Amino acid sequence: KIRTLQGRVVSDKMEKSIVVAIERFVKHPIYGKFIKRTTKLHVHDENNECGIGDVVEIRECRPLSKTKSWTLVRVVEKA
């Protein structure tokens, strides 16, 4: 394999860019309860394939802008 993350598109308003929320489920360090945590990445989407709510595979790449260092691999599910 090559390394990828999966997440939900939360914005598609930029040209050739999307914001992808990666949800992770982590044990709280002190109290032990499993908690939802989110990491939002700015992702490159050359063709503007993706829409708000799509599940997408993304991969880490070279910096493409100030905030973008991840690129779209596929759409797993369209909204």
């Binding site: 709280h28 002190i30 109290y31 032990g32 309860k33 908690i35």
Partner: peptide
């Protein structure tokens, strides 16, 4: 509760 402590620790 655990959820209260998660929200506001001791």
């Amino acid at each position: 509760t655990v959820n209260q402590l998660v929200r506001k620790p001791r």
